Amino acid sequence: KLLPPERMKHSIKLVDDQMNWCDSAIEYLLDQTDVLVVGVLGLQGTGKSMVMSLLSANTPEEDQRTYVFRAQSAEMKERGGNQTSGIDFFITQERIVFLDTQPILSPSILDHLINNYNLPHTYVEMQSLQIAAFLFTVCHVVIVVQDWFTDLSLYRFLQTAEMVKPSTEYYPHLVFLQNKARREDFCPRKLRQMHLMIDQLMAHSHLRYKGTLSMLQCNVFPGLPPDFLDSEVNLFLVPFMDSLLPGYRGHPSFQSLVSKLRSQVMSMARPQLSHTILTEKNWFHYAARIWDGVRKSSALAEYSRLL
């Protein structure tokens, strides 16, 4: 007399490809409070679907075909086209809501929009900005994935997006994840440089990007002292799938790192959104309301008129 409602087997489309709300996840929500929301931001081929699938209901021992979130296929990499479009949705058994996101400023979207108000570039930029604001207003934790380092363009985009939010103010947490890492990225000398440049590039970001999710506290570097770094920011690295010196790949096992990241993300804080207690159904309604409100907003139009 206490059986669960139902178990989700595959992700659903929360936002349509034409920027339209899709109310089809109510049957998978209950009247429970204290829910966790995860958002993801990144480039075209960063690997958001793979990381989200591995962190929600998948393990590296599985195959990309049975993953919760559909990943890129062999025939799609050659054409250089995106795979995930719109916004996805999936809830695990632990009552954890996972939200995916389509690529931002991806050339595939522009190419598909060419053969279809002034220029498509402005429309793509506005769409990315709107999705970023939505992810920054109703998500408890946001993870940023970057295929390569020193992009110098995503930080500015995030700073501009945080200033175009709709509305005792609340700032969601952020996580810097570097996908497809190499041995050169697993050295203390480079780690310090990464931390200093990150701190100097987000001096007045007004966000929570430090004091939580410390890499040094994850036992990755057993002998590295915490005082060696001036300020250990919330950063994490992910290596590839599992030469005068044989062996010595230069980084820990991929499974161990993904497991540690999953545990750290699962044990993250869950602060209140507004000055009222929100439930699963209430959270969904709030998300739909803010989505509709941001669609017909004035900040986006004002910013677009300047371009």
Binding site: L2, L30, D34, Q93, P188, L224, L245, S267, R270
Partner: protein, 820 residues
């Protein structure tokens, strides 16, 4: 470093700075602090040294050129120990060191001429490093360490084996599967003389400390109702509705804004305890308003479940659903696991309620004011409910084989009785104490109750100590004196035995206890006589309430098997439940199996007997080996149940019956595929237990002897060369005889003495007047304990005279003279 490999890997240059010393002593600063910022240099140096040493067989033969390399193995071992003992190593470096250690360990056992290498301090440091390498987050490292330890299992001192036992115990319950199997095999390879030791376990103590620290912390109130519902459904009904879910739940229940060790997060015991404690806290903190129903709904549900379980104890034919029927071998074990978790949950709930209505000091944090004010007004209701359910809780606890729960509940019930429900409480408490081998508590309760008709408690107190003969005699005398009819049976002389050491429920208890006591010493004739006496007494008394709760078919089967008559044994075994006799594998245990450990032990014994008779009939190499091996493997897999259950809680010890059954199953499995060709087919019970297992009774040696005689008699049907079992059998018989005599069991001791040598005091005198000296000393000791001091003295003096003109006469003349 890479270029130096040309000279390092040379096959024969005598330069001033030796390459070995250069990479082992000159470049020793790279392991101090350079390994933290530049681990590549350390890895390269270690790789070069390993490559240069592996080409010369790690310099083992040496331990001109030979004289120069006379101190290389010690240096290598010392370096390995120092590096492995560290806690700030890299993954690649640790893996390379583990591989090198495994190779060295395997090569160390390649020959028997390297025996002196097991005493150097370098070897001890290496073993310490290997022991410290296991029990880490990495799985491959643990597997490599376990394999290396299992390789050179022998030649290690008791100090290392003691820690290895604790490591295997804590690792027996892991979220993975390979780790459990590896540690299980390693544990099986350890002799029983160390596994049964009463030494303190550091790992169990650490787990207990972590749990205590977690409970002592302030409440978190982060447990969601869905998690509680899932746990309740998995405990009351067995369905969890989840697909390593414990680790995920534990990680999701934590918070980063606001401390259990990570290495202990992979253990199911810690996770289960944490989940139960959190569920109890959520139930108490929610004013008993759990999603299961209203405030009284939870009480009614728990009361009904406990009442049904308690009722099933009286009549095992009830066959309670969701608690007695399983679908495979996993369900049977899961049932017992759920029962244990339920008992723990009830205990935690009681502790929380007590701390919530009054408050503890330096133990648990005080709950909010609302909880205290709500529990203070409804304290009478809670006390009444607990008191009303204590009787059922005691029965449930005894059924699940948890005497501690019933002992605590009985003590609380007796304390609350400050004002015919009194005899039953004492009965249950006495039985529980008897199962824990605590004669002092039994005697104390007997004396305390004497001031309120309860003179039979002394018999149970004496029985708990191991004196089965005296206990049986006292039981028969008490039954005859309280019933009015003669219920005595043939046995040894009462005068000699003493010098060597009314309600229907009470009558039934005494009869059942006497039957179990007689079965313990393996006296089939006595059991038959007892059954006849009970039948006659019942027919001449019309009790209509006395009935022995023991399947006589199993007893008859055991007697036939021990007598060597396999023809009748097969027919008797055919009527036993479960899978048919071997001529499909997962569902070996039958349905409607009670969660009582006694039933599981009986089923395991039946399976072993079936396999033994099957092999005996098949013998008189793949005809009957492809199925027997699988059958024994499944039996051994099911026998790891109690061992894991003991580790689930902080018990600091393991059951002797379960451990012996598992060891016997493993020995049988090895003898089936080896046909008695290796020493691994013998029982690890040696004489070493004389100075380390004096707190156990004679029951454990009975199983070992029973299964050893089978192989001894089976040797007559093998023409190929086999290992000698006469020495092992004689050693086991002598040790068992010594332990039997050390407790007054004159009958069992005499039986063992007669068996090794191949009812009246004069009978022993007329039948008694490498292991020769031990046998003579044992005979003299038995005669002295039998009351014939003169005969024992004469035999000891004659023995001393004979040993004085012997060859060795080292531990015989001295012992004989001292005893005399």
């Amino acid at each position: 470093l890479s270029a130096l490999t040309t000279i390092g890997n040379a096959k024969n240059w005598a330069l001033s700075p030796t390459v070995f010393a250069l990479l082992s002593k000159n470049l020793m600063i790279v392991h101090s602090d350079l390994a933290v910022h530049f681990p590549a240099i350390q890895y390269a140096v270690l790789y070069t040294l390993y490559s240069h040493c592996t080409r010369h067989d790690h310099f083992i033969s040496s331990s001109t050129v030979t004289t120069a390399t006379k101190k290389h193995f010690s240096i290598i071992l010392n370096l390995l120990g120092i590096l492995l003992k560290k806690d700030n190593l890299n993954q690649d470096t640790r893996k390379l060191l583990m591989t090198w250690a495994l190779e060295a360990a395997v090569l160390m056992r390649k020959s028997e001429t390297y025996a002196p290498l097991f005493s150097l301090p370098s070897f001890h440091k290496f073993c310490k490093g290997l022991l410290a390498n296991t029990l880490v987050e990495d799985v491959n490292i643990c597997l490599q360490a376990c394999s290396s330890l299992h390789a050179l299992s022998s030649s290690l001192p008791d100090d290392l084996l003691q820690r290895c036992v604790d490591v295997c115990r804590v690792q027996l319950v892991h979220s993975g599967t390979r780790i459990r199997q590896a540690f299980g095999k390693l544990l099986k390879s350890i002799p029983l003389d160390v596994v049964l030791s009463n030494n303190n376990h550091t790992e169990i103590q650490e787990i207990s400390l972590a749990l205590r620290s977690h409970m002592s912390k302030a409440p978190s109130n982060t447990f969601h109702p869905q998690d509680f519902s899932d746990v309740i459904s998995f405990i009351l009904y067995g369905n969890s509705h989840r697909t390593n879910w414990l680790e995920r739940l534990f990680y999701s229940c934590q918070r980063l804004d606001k401390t259990i060790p990570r290495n202990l997060l992979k253990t199911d015991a810690v996770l289960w305890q944490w989940a139960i404690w959190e569920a109890a806290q959520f139930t108490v903190l929610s004013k008993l308003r759990t999603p299961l129903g209203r405030a009284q709904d939870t009480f009614q549900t728990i009361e009904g479940i406990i009442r049904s379980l308690a009722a099933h104890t009286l009549n095992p034919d009830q066959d309670v659903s969701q608690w007695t029927t399983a679908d495979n071998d996993e369900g049977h074990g899961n049932n017992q696991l759920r029962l244990v978790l339920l008992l723990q949950y009830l205990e935690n709930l009681e502790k929380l309620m007590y701390n919530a209505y009054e408050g503890c000091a330096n133990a648990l944090t005080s709950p909010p004011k609302v909880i205290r004010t709500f529990f203070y007004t409804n304290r009478q209701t809670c006390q009444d409910w607990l008191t009303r359910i204590r009787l059922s809780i005691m029965r449930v606890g005894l059924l699940a084989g948890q005497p501690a729960v019933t002992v605590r509940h009985g003590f609380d019930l007796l304390t609350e009785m400050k004002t015919n429900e009194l005899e039953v409480t004492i009965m249950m408490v006495v039985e529980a104490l008897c199962e824990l081998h605590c004669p002092e508590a039994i005697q104390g309760i007997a004396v305390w109750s004497s001031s309120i008709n309860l003179l039979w408690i002394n018999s149970v107190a004496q029985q708990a100590e191991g004196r089965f003969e005296k206990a049986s005699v006292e039981y028969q005398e008490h039954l005859c004196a309280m019933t009015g009819v003669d219920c005595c049976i043939s046995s040894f002389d009462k005068s000699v035995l003493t010098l060597a050491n009314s309600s229907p429920e009470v009558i039934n208890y005494l009869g059942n206890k006497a039957c179990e006591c007689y079965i313990s010493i393996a006296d089939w004739a006595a059991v038959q006589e007892w059954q006849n006496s009970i039948h006659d007494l019942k027919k001449s008394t019309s009790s209509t309430s006395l009935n022995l709760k023991a399947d006589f078919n199993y007893i008859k089967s055991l007697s036939s098997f021990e007598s060597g008559k396999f023809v009748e044994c097969t027919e008797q075994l055919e009527l036993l439940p479960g899978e048919n006799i071997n001529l499909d594998m997962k569902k070996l245990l039958p349905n409607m199996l009670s969660p009582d450990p006694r039933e599981l032990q009986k089923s395991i014994e039946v399976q072993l007997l079936r396999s033994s008779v099957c092999l005996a009939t098949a013998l008189n190499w793949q005809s009957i080996t492809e199925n027997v091996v699988k059958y024994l493997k499944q039996t051994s897999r099911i026998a790891i149940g109690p061992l894991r259950l003991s580790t689930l809680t902080v018990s600091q010890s393991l059951p002797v019956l379960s451990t012996l059954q598992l060891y016997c199953s493993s020995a049988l499995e090895n003898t089936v595929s080896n046909r008695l060709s290796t020493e691994d087919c013998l029982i690890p019970l040696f004489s070493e237990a004389l100075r380390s297992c004096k707190q156990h009774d004679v029951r454990p040696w009975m199983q070992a002897l029973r299964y050893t005689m089978y192989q001894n008699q089976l040797l007559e049907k093998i023409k190929e060369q086999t290992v000698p079992i006469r020495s092992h059998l004689m050693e086991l018989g002598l040790t068992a005889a010594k332990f039997a005599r050390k407790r007054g069991n004159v009958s069992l001791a005499t039986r063992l003495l007669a068996q090794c040598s191949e009812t009246t005091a004069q009978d022993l005198v007329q039948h008694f007047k490498k292991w020769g000296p031990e046998l003579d000393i044992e005979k003299t000791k038995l005669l002295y304990t039998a009351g014939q001091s003169t005969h024992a003295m004469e035999m000891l003096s004659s023995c001393a005279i004979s040993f004085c003109k012997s060859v060795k006469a080292e531990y015989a003349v001295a012992k004989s003279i001292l005893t005399l």
